[PDB]
Design an enzyme around this catalytic site. Structure first.
Site, PDB file in Angstrom:
ATOM      1  N   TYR E  26     -57.624  87.001  13.749  1.00 11.41           N
ATOM      2  CA  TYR E  26     -56.503  86.267  14.307  1.00 11.41           C
ATOM      3  C   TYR E  26     -55.534  87.212  14.988  1.00 11.41           C
ATOM      4  O   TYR E  26     -55.397  88.369  14.590  1.00 11.41           O
ATOM      5  CB  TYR E  26     -55.784  85.465  13.221  1.00 11.41           C
ATOM      6  CG  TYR E  26     -54.834  86.281  12.401  1.00 11.41           C
ATOM      7  CD1 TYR E  26     -55.298  87.203  11.484  1.00 11.41           C
ATOM      8  CD2 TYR E  26     -53.468  86.135  12.548  1.00 11.41           C
ATOM      9  CE1 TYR E  26     -54.427  87.959  10.735  1.00 11.41           C
ATOM     10  CE2 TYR E  26     -52.590  86.883  11.804  1.00 11.41           C
ATOM     11  CZ  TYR E  26     -53.075  87.793  10.900  1.00 11.41           C
ATOM     12  OH  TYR E  26     -52.198  88.541  10.160  1.00 11.41           O
ATOM     13  N   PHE E  36     -46.629  90.144  17.636  1.00 14.48           N
ATOM     14  CA  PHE E  36     -46.089  90.650  16.384  1.00 14.48           C
ATOM     15  C   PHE E  36     -47.144  90.911  15.326  1.00 14.48           C
ATOM     16  O   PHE E  36     -46.817  91.484  14.289  1.00 14.48           O
ATOM     17  CB  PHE E  36     -45.039  89.689  15.805  1.00 14.48           C
ATOM     18  CG  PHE E  36     -45.616  88.468  15.152  1.00 14.48           C
ATOM     19  CD1 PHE E  36     -46.037  87.406  15.916  1.00 14.48           C
ATOM     20  CD2 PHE E  36     -45.706  88.366  13.780  1.00 14.48           C
ATOM     21  CE1 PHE E  36     -46.561  86.274  15.334  1.00 14.48           C
ATOM     22  CE2 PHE E  36     -46.231  87.240  13.191  1.00 14.48           C
ATOM     23  CZ  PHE E  36     -46.654  86.193  13.969  1.00 14.48           C
ATOM     24  N   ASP E  37     -48.378  90.484  15.535  1.00 12.44           N
ATOM     25  CA  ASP E  37     -49.400  90.646  14.520  1.00 12.44           C
ATOM     26  C   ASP E  37     -50.749  90.667  15.209  1.00 12.44           C
ATOM     27  O   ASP E  37     -50.886  90.191  16.335  1.00 12.44           O
ATOM     28  CB  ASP E  37     -49.327  89.515  13.490  1.00 12.44           C
ATOM     29  CG  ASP E  37     -50.112  89.811  12.234  1.00 12.44           C
ATOM     30  OD1 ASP E  37     -50.689  90.911  12.133  1.00 12.44           O
ATOM     31  OD2 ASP E  37     -50.160  88.941  11.342  1.00 12.44           O
ATOM     32  N   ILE E  56     -49.352  80.927   5.203  1.00  7.48           N
ATOM     33  CA  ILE E  56     -48.375  79.875   5.477  1.00  7.48           C
ATOM     34  C   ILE E  56     -49.081  78.564   5.814  1.00  7.48           C
ATOM     35  O   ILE E  56     -50.253  78.531   6.206  1.00  7.48           O
ATOM     36  CB  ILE E  56     -47.416  80.286   6.602  1.00  7.48           C
ATOM     37  CG1 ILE E  56     -48.205  80.725   7.826  1.00  7.48           C
ATOM     38  CG2 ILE E  56     -46.500  81.385   6.127  1.00  7.48           C
ATOM     39  CD1 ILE E  56     -47.340  81.071   8.989  1.00  7.48           C
ATOM     40  N   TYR E  82     -42.171  80.108   9.000  1.00  4.71           N
ATOM     41  CA  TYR E  82     -41.205  80.867   8.204  1.00  4.71           C
ATOM     42  C   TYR E  82     -39.805  80.261   8.156  1.00  4.71           C
ATOM     43  O   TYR E  82     -39.031  80.610   7.261  1.00  4.71           O
ATOM     44  CB  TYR E  82     -41.102  82.297   8.737  1.00  4.71           C
ATOM     45  CG  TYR E  82     -42.235  83.207   8.314  1.00  4.71           C
ATOM     46  CD1 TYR E  82     -42.137  83.984   7.171  1.00  4.71           C
ATOM     47  CD2 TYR E  82     -43.397  83.294   9.064  1.00  4.71           C
ATOM     48  CE1 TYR E  82     -43.164  84.816   6.787  1.00  4.71           C
ATOM     49  CE2 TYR E  82     -44.428  84.122   8.686  1.00  4.71           C
ATOM     50  CZ  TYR E  82     -44.304  84.880   7.548  1.00  4.71           C
ATOM     51  OH  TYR E  82     -45.331  85.707   7.169  1.00  4.71           O
ATOM     52  N   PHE E  99     -50.631  81.277  17.505  1.00  3.32           N
ATOM     53  CA  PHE E  99     -51.733  81.997  16.901  1.00  3.32           C
ATOM     54  C   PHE E  99     -52.994  81.747  17.699  1.00  3.32           C
ATOM     55  O   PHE E  99     -53.239  80.626  18.145  1.00  3.32           O
ATOM     56  CB  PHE E  99     -51.952  81.554  15.464  1.00  3.32           C
ATOM     57  CG  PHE E  99     -50.870  81.968  14.547  1.00  3.32           C
ATOM     58  CD1 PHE E  99     -50.840  83.244  14.032  1.00  3.32           C
ATOM     59  CD2 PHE E  99     -49.870  81.086  14.204  1.00  3.32           C
ATOM     60  CE1 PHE E  99     -49.841  83.629  13.185  1.00  3.32           C
ATOM     61  CE2 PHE E  99     -48.864  81.467  13.357  1.00  3.32           C
ATOM     62  CZ  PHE E  99     -48.847  82.738  12.850  1.00  3.32           C
TER      63      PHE E  99
END
Ligand SMILES: [Ca+2]
Ligand SMILES: [Ca+2]
Lengths: 64, 68, 647, 139, 107, 97
Positions: E26, E36-37, E56, E82, E99
């Protein structure tokens, strides 16, 4: 007379059989403790004129 | 079997079953040695097992097996 | 980022941002290290290392940031545990070949663990963010070797090109990653021999080097020397397993065969009957001035000690061909020289740190060692609730009692000291001082070590921070004889400050231990502070009874000043009378304070209640011959059988 | 000491111009400060060391660290070996610096603390009349 | 309700059930497009159990409606994500997430 | 020149920087004058590098003023020498900041 001739036996027996016989790991710990106090502080230390002779060998000297 | 009981009864002075340091000192000061307190505490705690400090009856017998 | 070379302001502001990504995540902020793994984003750290056109500063930025994110929290935990050398003595520890006739083979010591958390974004983040971020080491540990060989074997033509713009930025943050990659327990023997051909060949160390790149090389050889000392100390314990088992029997059986076929102790049992450690110097001090002593002189001939020559050749050559400024280079150059001429003294100052433990207690000392650095890394930082969980898990650990010379040698009576002095520039002290009072009782000679900070500890009485000073003197006799007068003098100065209370009952409770300590008074400490307390103020029948109506403050301050003055009474023998001027203090305790004891002996235990009589009856039983057996008789024993059915 | 050893005479000349062109008050203030405590054989710590000897790494009193004490005064001697007429006057009046320290007077008063000391170790031992080993080694 | 845009088709019928591990590769980004990821970056296929409240809820519900080989571009709601507290350092308060997830294996 | 005279009087002396404790709220109050920002920034940078006592005065409101200077002025590296000198003291690392 004969009664106290074993009083020298039993009292000195307390300090007889354990003398690094009972502890195993506290003996090897204690062996190196005695080894570092007598057997290590030797006298190879006669380098102290070979070094200062080799520090004053050329600027500015390594000793300076 | 019984003469070590006699040496224990000579060593026992207060009738408690645990020989303290003081009786060992009073027999040592007439035996022929001049010790320190650390060596005398060792001669009760060199055969020390659990933390009772004082030497009692069964470890004195099993130590008497380890000499005579 | 390559176009940043010609943009002066836009280069300097991204240099000084990479300093902030490292100054923020410094000394182990494992929540922030998991946060800057999103702005710095690992596969570009592998890119910015390899790129040979990145600017001068920004090469040094991305190297110093990679270290302070993934590496330099574990590498500092292998620099606190560099001088401990505690070592298990299980079966393969005897399999050290002891000098095979720096690329070491076994190294069986007990160095810390590394644990790496995978930096994701989930809902268990307090469990994840507790160690460090990870990034793949098998890629990196091969990459920095080809980054070295591409540097030195190409840079030997001394170009005016090279990677950083000078040759400082080419070699400084390449060695600094190479250095802090060596310490972290990687670079196995297929890579140590592969990398030693770059320095030794037996070449980087014989090149031409500027100053602050050769400073990093001094810290490279200074690990290679402390990798052999780890091998020598691991060779001694490999030798001191059978050699103490060939002495546990051969001495003791001749101490038993002789003392079976003897009864008395003229000299045959008396010859070694002493302390166990003092007997260890007896059997091992004799071998140089039998049969077992034909083993040492072979080994002590072969524990003479190569790279001891090429160090002491280069570090004097570097001082020859230059006038070396930057006086951190000069000092770091000479410590590494002097260690080559004194290999003995470095081997001296490792043996009062080493220790041996068995294979079964391996499973609990590492949890202590893991929970010790957490105490030790917290020395430099509501920062406290990790210490209290840490200090408590030391005390609840198995190996804290059974090896109390190890715990005296790791230094943790001074680590918890330096935690305390920080706080005393509140609830931390009461779990700091409670550790020391638990520490003084587990051993006698341990209490002797803790005694030395007594001269500081008395300046820190708050209301507990004096209980350490009490339980350092408490039961043993030599330390009670050891302290001088100005140690005690500052205490009774402070009682004059208590001429207003409740803090007098705790100052005095230290002074009880300095004078009595075994069941009988100490004569020199008897003659002190009563020679002081004449010149201090502290009728008294009016105070001791009116406190019943008022409610345990002055009721027990005077009921402990009595028990102080009862101990510092000379003797219960004719040592009291038939002596010289020891009768003078016998009169001062009965004429400065008249008896008046009827306020104490009967009225207090008839409803605090039993103890204040017990303090008063001791002062009667020392300073104060048959008619008095009858006058004070049946005092208090009226309630002896009276409340007997009210247990 | 191992440089001034035979009463070297250039080294007492280098160590005097340096006290007059780089005018040090702190040297002479340190030297009177170094002999301020420096030692004394005291018997008060000996009796407790004697009383502990009845029932229990020893010798930790000895003349209150004599090895520093001989070496400090042997160093002070070698600054005047060969009869330097100036180092016997730059230890008394000290004309260069502002505040003058009188080391010659000050080194008398250390000795006076050794006269009263080793006279008092006599008086404790004046009655027993038989030498013990630890009364030799400390005397 | 989260926006699940399919990108590539997998096989559709073999879907992850409740009580299995999910091998996902992912890559996540903010609404602005800033990344960010990832999981291609750190080079480990992610894994988690459905229902144990670990990942989450937007990621979990959007990973529910996929299959093997199918990749999706989840556009998760910040209130399922979040939230207003966000995450101190990485995610700003109340920002939508994009995502790109891809399943590889299951249990 | 009045701000540079203040910065010289403190810069070496650690004892002087301790006695610049209580006045620190007033300097950061004056930080948004945008004409005297270069004086107070170099004064405050020559304070936090010296004495750890002045590091303890800085609360959450004082940092967000220094962050807000960075938004209104942008490419100024001398702001990032303050925040680099704020999250690590002499040797110790103030993990609140
Ligand atoms: Ca008894
Ligand atoms: Ca018992």
């Amino acid at each position: 007379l004969l009664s106290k001739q074993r009083k020298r036996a039993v009292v000195a027996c307390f300090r007889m059989a354990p003398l690094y016989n009972l502890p195993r790991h506290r003996a090897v710990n204690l062996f190196l403790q005695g080894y570092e106090k007598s057997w290590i502080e030797t006298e190879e230390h006669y380098f102290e004129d070979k070094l200062i002779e080799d520090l004053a060998k050329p600027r500015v000297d390594p000793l300076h | 079997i019984a003469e070590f009981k006699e040496a224990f009864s000579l060593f026992d002075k207060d009738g408690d079953g645990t020989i303290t340091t003081k009786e060992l000192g009073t027999v040592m000061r007439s035996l022929g040695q001049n010790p320190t307190e650390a060596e005398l505490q060792d001669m009760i705690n060199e055969v020390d097992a659990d933390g009772n400090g004082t030497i009692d009856f069964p470890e004195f017998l099993t130590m008497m097996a380890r000499k005579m | 980022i390559l176009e940043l070379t010609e943009q002066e302001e836009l280069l300097k502001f991204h240099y000084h941002t990479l300093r902030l990504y490292s100054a923020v995540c410094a000394l182990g902020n494992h929540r922030v290290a998991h946060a800057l793994c999103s702005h710095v984003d690992e596969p570009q750290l592998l890119y910015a290392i390899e790129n040979k056109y990145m600017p001068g500063l920004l090469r040094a930025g991305y190297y110093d940031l990679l270290i302070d994110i993934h590496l330099s929290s574990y590498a500092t935990a292998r620099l606190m545990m560099n001088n401990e050398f505690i070592v298990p003595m299980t079966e393969e520890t005897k399999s050290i070949t002891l000098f095979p006739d720096p690329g070491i083979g076994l190294s069986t010591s007990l160095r810390p663990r590394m644990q790496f958390s995978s930096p994701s974004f989930v809902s268990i983040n307090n469990e994840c963010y507790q160690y460090s971020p990870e990034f793949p080491l098998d890629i990196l540990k091969a990459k920095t070797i080809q980054m070295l060989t591409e540097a030195v074997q190409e840079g030997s033509l001394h170009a005016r090109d090279p990677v950083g713009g000078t040759t400082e930025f080419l070699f400084v943050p390449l060695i600094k990653l190479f250095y802090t990659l060596l310490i972290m327990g990687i670079f196995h023997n297929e890579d140590l021999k592969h990398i030693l051909q770059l320095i030794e060949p037996s070449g980087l160390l014989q090149m031409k080097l500027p100053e602050p790149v050769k400073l990093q090389m001094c810290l490279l050889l200074q690990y290679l020397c402390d990798c052999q000392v780890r091998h020598r100390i691991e060779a001694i314990v490999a030798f001191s397993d059978d050699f103490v088992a060939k002495l546990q029997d051969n001495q003791r059986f001749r101490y038993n065969e002789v003392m079976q076929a003897l009864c008395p102790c003229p000299e045959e049992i008396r010859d070694q009957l002493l302390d166990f450690h003092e007997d260890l110097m007896t059997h091992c001090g004799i071998e140089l001035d039998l049969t077992i002593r034909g083993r040492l002189l072979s080994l002590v001939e072969k524990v003479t000690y190569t790279l001891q020559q090429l160090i002491s050749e280069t570090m004097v050559r570097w001082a020859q061909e230059s006038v070396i400024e930057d006086p951190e280079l000069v000092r770091a150059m000479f410590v590494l020289l002097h260690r080559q001429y004194d290999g003995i003294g470095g081997l001296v100052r490792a043996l009062p740190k080493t220790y041996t433990i068995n294979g079964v207690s391996v499973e609990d000392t590492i949890n202590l060692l893991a929970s010790l650095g957490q105490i030790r890394s917290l020395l430099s930082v509501e920062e406290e609730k990790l210490m209290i969980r840490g200090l408590g898990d030391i005390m609840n650990n198995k190996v804290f009692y059974q090896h109390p010379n190890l715990m005296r040698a790791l230094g943790m009576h001074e680590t918890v000291m330096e935690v305390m002095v920080n706080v005393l520039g509140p609830k931390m002290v009461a779990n700091c001082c409670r550790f020391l009072c638990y520490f003084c009782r587990i051993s006698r000679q341990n209490q002797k070590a803790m005694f030395d900070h007594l001269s500081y500890l008395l300046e820190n009485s708050s209301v507990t921070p004096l209980d350490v000073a009490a339980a350092s003197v408490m039961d043993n006799n030599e330390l009670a004889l050891a302290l001088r007068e100005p140690d005690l003098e500052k205490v009774v100065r402070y009682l004059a400050g208590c001429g207003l209370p409740v803090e007098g009952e705790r100052y005095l409770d230290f002074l009880r231990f300095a004078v009595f300590c075994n069941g009988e008074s100490v004569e020199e400490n008897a003659n002190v502070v009563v020679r002081l307390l004449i010149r201090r103020p502290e009728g008294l029948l009016a105070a001791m009874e009116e406190a019943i109506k008022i409610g345990n403050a002055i009721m027990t301050f005077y009921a402990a000043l009595i028990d102080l003055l009862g101990r510092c009474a000379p003797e219960m023998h004719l040592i009291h009378a038939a002596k010289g001027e020891a009768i003078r203090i016998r009169s001062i305790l009965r004429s400065l304070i008249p008896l008046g004891d009827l306020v104490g002996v009967i009225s207090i235990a008839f409803q605090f209640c039993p103890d204040h009589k017990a303090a008063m009856v001791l002062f009667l039983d020392r300073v104060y011959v048959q008619d008095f057996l009858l006058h004070l008789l049946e005092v208090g024993f009226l309630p002896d059988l009276r409340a007997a059915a009210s247990l | 000491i191992a440089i001034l050893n035979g009463g070297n005479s250039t080294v007492q000349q280098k160590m005097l111009e340096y006290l007059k062109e780089k005018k040090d008050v702190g040297f002479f203030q340190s030297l009177a400060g170094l002999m301020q405590s420096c030692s004394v054989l005291d018997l008060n710590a000996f009796e407790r060391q004697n009383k502990a000897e009845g029932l229990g790494g020893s010798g930790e009193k000895v003349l209150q660290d004599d090895e520093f004490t001989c070496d400090l005064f042997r160093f002070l001697q070698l600054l005047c070996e060969g009869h330097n007429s100036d180092f016997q006057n730059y230890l008394r009046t000290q004309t260069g610096n502002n505040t003058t320290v009188n080391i010659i007077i000050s080194t008398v008063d250390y000795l006076l603390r050794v006269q009263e000391s080793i006279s008092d170790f006599y008086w404790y031992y004046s009655g027993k009349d038989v030498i013990d080993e630890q009364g030799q080694r400390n005397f | 309700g989260v926006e699940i845009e399919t990108i590539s088709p997998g096989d559709g019928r073999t879907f992850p059930k409740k009580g299995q591990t999910c091998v996902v590769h992912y890559t996540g980004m903010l609404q602005n497009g800033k990344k960010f990821d990832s999981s291609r970056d750190r080079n480990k296929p992610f894994k988690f159990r459905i229902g144990k409240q670990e990942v989450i809820k937007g990621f979990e519900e959007g990973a529910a409606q996929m299959s093997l080989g199918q990749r999706a571009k989840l556009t998760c709601t910040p209130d399922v994500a979040y939230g207003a507290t966000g995450h101190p350092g990485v995610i700003p308060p109340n920002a939508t997430l994009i995502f790109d997830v891809e399943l590889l294996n299951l249990e | 020149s009045l701000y540079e005279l203040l910065a010289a009087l403190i810069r070496g002396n650690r004892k002087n920087c301790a006695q610049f404790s209580g006045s620190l709220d007033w300097l950061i109050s004056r930080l948004e004058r945008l004409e005297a920002s270069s004086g107070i920034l170099e004064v405050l940078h020559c304070v936090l590098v010296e004495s750890p006592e002045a590091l303890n005065i800085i609360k959450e409101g004082h940092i967000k003023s220094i962050i807000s200077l960075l938004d209104k002025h942008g490419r100024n590296h001398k702001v990032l020498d303050v925040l680099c000198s704020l999250c690590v003291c002499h040797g110790v690392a103030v993990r609140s900041n």
